[PDB]
Automatic annotation (TrEMBL), chain A:
This is Multifunctional fusion protein. The lineage of its organism: Bacteria, Bacillati, Actinomycetota, Actinomycetes, Mycobacteriales. F-type ATPases have 2 components, F(1) - the catalytic core - and F(0) - the membrane proton channel. F(1) has five subunits: alpha(3), beta(3), gamma(1), delta(1), epsilon(1). F(0) has three main subunits: a(1), b(2) and c(10-14). The alpha and beta chains form an alternating ring which encloses part of the gamma chain. F(1) is attached to F(0) by a central stalk formed by the gamma and epsilon chains, while a peripheral stalk is formed by the delta and b chains. It is found in: Cell membrane. In the N-terminal section; belongs to the ATPase B chain family. In the C-terminal section; belongs to the ATPase delta chain family.
Amino acid sequence: TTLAGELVSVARLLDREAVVTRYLTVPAEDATPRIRLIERLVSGKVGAP
Amino acid sequence: TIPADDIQSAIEEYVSSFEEVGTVVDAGDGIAHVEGLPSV
């Protein structure tokens, strides 16, 4: 239930501003910069799973 | 919700965090489109 809550929160986030999703939906077989953005955008606010 | 204005911090973090190779997307009539190659 906390997973679902946090996921819909992330969904509302990625919906409210499309400019971040643009840098988040670029195609590249190694997205470790996008993974970094993940590790440095919500890591201090969300759970582990 | 959304913590404010750290979003641009993470955006530039992504930009700066990234031998460059692009990939063809479209090709027709002697004109191609290439995704990637941020430093051309």
